Amino acid sequence: RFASVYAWNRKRISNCVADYSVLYNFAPFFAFKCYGVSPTKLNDLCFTN
Amino acid sequence: FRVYSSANNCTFEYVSQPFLKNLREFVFKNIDG
Numbered sequence: 001r002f003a004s005v006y007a008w009n010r011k012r013i014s015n016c017v018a019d020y021s022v023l024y025n026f027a028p029f030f031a032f033k034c035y036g037v038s039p040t041k042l043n044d045l046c047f048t049n
Numbered sequence: 050f051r052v053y054s055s056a057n058n059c060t061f062e063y064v065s066q067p068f069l070k071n072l073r074e075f076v077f078k079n080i081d082g
Contacts (some may be wrong), residue, residue: 015062 014049 003009022042
């Protein structure tokens with residue numbers, strides 16, 4: 001399933017080995033935009049939350 | 050008992066397995082986060 005906009009969900013990912021390679025999730029994305037960070041350099045940067 | 054206080058609002062995750070003439074020595078420190 002998923003959720004609505006008025007009650008959009010928020011999942012906290014703070015303890016994981018991040019396999020940022022979710023490009024398999026329907027690769028033909030209609031909108032794949034990045035703000036504040038570039039597309040691929042994203043995979044090799046650390047963050048708190 | 051099981052619930053210590055009324056509210057408990059945290060989203061941390063750190064699990065491990067049992068840390069279990071029975072001297073159980075422990076040393077606690079907090080440095081460099």
